[PDB]
Scaffold this active site. Structure first.
Site, PDB file in Angstrom:
ATOM      1  N   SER A  10       0.827  -1.165   0.000  1.00  0.00           N
ATOM      2  CA  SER A  10       0.000   0.000   0.000  1.00  0.00           C
ATOM      3  C   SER A  10       0.871   1.227   0.000  1.00  0.00           C
ATOM      4  O   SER A  10       2.018   1.181   0.457  1.00  0.00           O
ATOM      5  CB  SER A  10      -0.932   0.019   1.236  1.00  0.00           C
ATOM      6  N   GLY A  11       0.302   2.326  -0.473  1.00  0.00           N
ATOM      7  CA  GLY A  11       0.950   3.617  -0.366  1.00  0.00           C
ATOM      8  C   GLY A  11       0.151   4.685  -1.059  1.00  0.00           C
ATOM      9  O   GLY A  11      -1.074   4.639  -1.051  1.00  0.00           O
ATOM     10  N   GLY A  12       0.844   5.625  -1.702  1.00  0.00           N
ATOM     11  CA  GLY A  12       0.189   6.752  -2.357  1.00  0.00           C
ATOM     12  C   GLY A  12      -0.739   6.300  -3.446  1.00  0.00           C
ATOM     13  O   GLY A  12      -1.704   6.996  -3.755  1.00  0.00           O
ATOM     14  N   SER A  15      -4.272   0.607  -1.906  1.00  0.00           N
ATOM     15  CA  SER A  15      -3.929  -0.676  -1.298  1.00  0.00           C
ATOM     16  C   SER A  15      -4.166  -1.771  -2.306  1.00  0.00           C
ATOM     17  O   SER A  15      -5.235  -1.835  -2.882  1.00  0.00           O
ATOM     18  CB  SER A  15      -4.761  -0.909  -0.001  1.00  0.00           C
ATOM     19  N   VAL A  16      -3.156  -2.607  -2.543  1.00  0.00           N
ATOM     20  CA  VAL A  16      -3.180  -3.600  -3.588  1.00  0.00           C
ATOM     21  C   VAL A  16      -3.134  -5.009  -2.969  1.00  0.00           C
ATOM     22  O   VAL A  16      -2.209  -5.306  -2.202  1.00  0.00           O
ATOM     23  CB  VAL A  16      -1.989  -3.441  -4.585  1.00  0.00           C
ATOM     24  N   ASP A 128       5.465   8.505 -14.235  1.00  0.00           N
ATOM     25  CA  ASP A 128       6.111   7.951 -13.038  1.00  0.00           C
ATOM     26  C   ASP A 128       6.869   6.673 -13.356  1.00  0.00           C
ATOM     27  O   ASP A 128       6.824   5.687 -12.609  1.00  0.00           O
ATOM     28  CB  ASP A 128       5.057   7.804 -11.920  1.00  0.00           C
TER      29      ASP A 128
HETATM   30  C1  LIG Z   1       2.772  -6.493  -7.169  1.00  0.00           C
HETATM   31  C2  LIG Z   1       1.714  -7.033  -8.139  1.00  0.00           C
HETATM   32  O1  LIG Z   1       1.553  -8.235  -8.299  1.00  0.00           O
HETATM   33  C3  LIG Z   1       0.836  -6.135  -8.958  1.00  0.00           C
HETATM   34  C4  LIG Z   1       0.169  -6.739 -10.014  1.00  0.00           C
HETATM   35  C5  LIG Z   1      -0.656  -5.996 -10.834  1.00  0.00           C
HETATM   36  C6  LIG Z   1      -0.791  -4.642 -10.557  1.00  0.00           C
HETATM   37  C7  LIG Z   1      -0.118  -4.051  -9.495  1.00  0.00           C
HETATM   38  C8  LIG Z   1      -0.294  -2.698  -9.339  1.00  0.00           C
HETATM   39  C9  LIG Z   1      -1.093  -1.923 -10.058  1.00  0.00           C
HETATM   40  N1  LIG Z   1      -0.954  -0.670  -9.651  1.00  0.00           N
HETATM   41  C10 LIG Z   1      -0.067  -0.618  -8.695  1.00  0.00           C
HETATM   42  C11 LIG Z   1       0.431   0.440  -7.984  1.00  0.00           C
HETATM   43  C12 LIG Z   1       1.387   0.159  -7.028  1.00  0.00           C
HETATM   44  C13 LIG Z   1       1.767  -1.161  -6.879  1.00  0.00           C
HETATM   45  N2  LIG Z   1       2.686  -1.418  -5.982  1.00  0.00           N
HETATM   46  C14 LIG Z   1       3.574  -2.586  -6.120  1.00  0.00           C
HETATM   47  C15 LIG Z   1       3.032  -3.680  -5.198  1.00  0.00           C
HETATM   48  C16 LIG Z   1       2.964  -3.259  -3.732  1.00  0.00           C
HETATM   49  C17 LIG Z   1       1.689  -3.331  -4.563  1.00  0.00           C
HETATM   50  N3  LIG Z   1       1.265  -2.162  -7.617  1.00  0.00           N
HETATM   51  N4  LIG Z   1       0.406  -1.923  -8.466  1.00  0.00           N
HETATM   52  C18 LIG Z   1       0.729  -4.795  -8.689  1.00  0.00           C
END
Ligand SMILES: CC(=O)c1cccc(-c2cnc3ccc(NCC4CC4)nn23)c1
Lengths: 266, 8
Positions: A10-12, A15-16, A128
């Site tokens: 999670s962050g800016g 939450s993923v 970014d």
């Molecule tokens: C880490 C991962 O499996 C994943 C897969 C598909 C999309 C994303 C995704 C989509 N938008 C974002 C924005 C930030 C983000 N952070 C990297 C991981 C910590 C969530 N991941 N992320 C992460």
């Protein structure tokens, strides 16, 4: 419809979560952003800009993580995105492996360039580009761009807003709060390439960014140094176009993603 | 020495 697994981060960006689509057990990522936290909206109704941009780029295969669906809730939006498996982000790959061999950096850099070209052809500026926003599909040797939450529609006029990562932001933004899309993208690509062949980014402070002295901390070939230094030209008009990057001599003889996985990832 | 840099 989706079975929610553990929180990935999670962050800016929100939450993923890891997830699986019930209908066919396809791995997904489930991304939650609160509406109060979103600043850049777009045109259904007002959606967050990430949704507009993702829809512009999610058609056809590419090196961009694709939007599979989205939902509005009262306080938030939820995005369902592809999830490669297994999967490591480029920031962590670099931390764990240190400076990348040039053959590998070339393969990764090439794929990022193709992805960014794709976005620009679709009318999308990411804004970014950095190692934290690039996923590696470790089996396929394929790189995927993520996180369009700071992006915009691509335009030929000046941008005077920016919410990307400052250490990847170009000198003209730092000094003037003004940049053009493509030339700022190329600067961020220079930062990224340096990061890959040196194991960390070249600049931490505003003063280093605008000074534009590139010091190489690792042994890097003369041809690779030349490309990086060109991407990092202080004057935007002195930076290469994407075509000039891809035609650069350092960029010739790129490995295929399967070869890259076999030699370097498996 | 090496760290993530959040957006914004
Ligand atoms: C880490 C991962 O499996 C994943 C897969 C598909 C999309 C994303 C995704 C989509 N938008 C974002 C924005 C930030 C983000 N952070 C990297 C991981 C910590 C969530 N991941 N992320 C992460």
């Amino acid at each position: 419809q989706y079975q929610v697994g553990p929180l990935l981060g999670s962050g800016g960006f929100g939450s993923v979560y890891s997830g699986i689509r019930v209908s066919d057990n396809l791995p997904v990522a489930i991304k939650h952003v609160e509406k109060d936290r979103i600043s850049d909206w777009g045109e259904g109704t007002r959606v967050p800009m990430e949704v507009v941009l993702l829809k512009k780029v999610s058609s056809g295969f590419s090196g961009v993580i694709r939007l599979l669906d989205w939902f509005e809730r009262p306080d938030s939006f939820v995005l369902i995105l592809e999830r490669p498996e297994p999967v490591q982000d480029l920031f962590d790959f670099i931390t764990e492996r240190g400076a990348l061999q040039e053959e590998l950096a070339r393969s990764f850099f090439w794929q990022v360039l193709e992805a960014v070209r794709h976005c620009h052809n679709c009318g999308v500026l990411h804004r970014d580009i950095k190692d934290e926003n690039i996923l590696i599909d470790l089996n396929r040797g394929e790189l995927k761009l993520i996180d369009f939450g700071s992006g915009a529609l691509l335009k030929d006029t000046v941008y005077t807003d920016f919410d990307g990562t400052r250490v990847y932001s170009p000198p003209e933004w730092i000094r003037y709060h003004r940049y053009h899309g493509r030339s700022a993208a190329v600067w961020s690509l220079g930062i990224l390439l340096y990061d890959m062949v040196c194991g960390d980014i070249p600049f931490e402070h505003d003063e280093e960014i605008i000074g534009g002295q590139v010091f190489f901390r690792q042994r890097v070939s003369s041809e690779c140094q030349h490309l990086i230094r060109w991407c990092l030209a202080l004057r935007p008009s002195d930076r290469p176009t994407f075509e000039e990057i891809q035609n650069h001599p350092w960029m010739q003889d790129v490995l295929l993603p399967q070869e890259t996985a076999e030699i370097h990832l498996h | 020495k090496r760290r993530r840099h959040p957006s914004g």
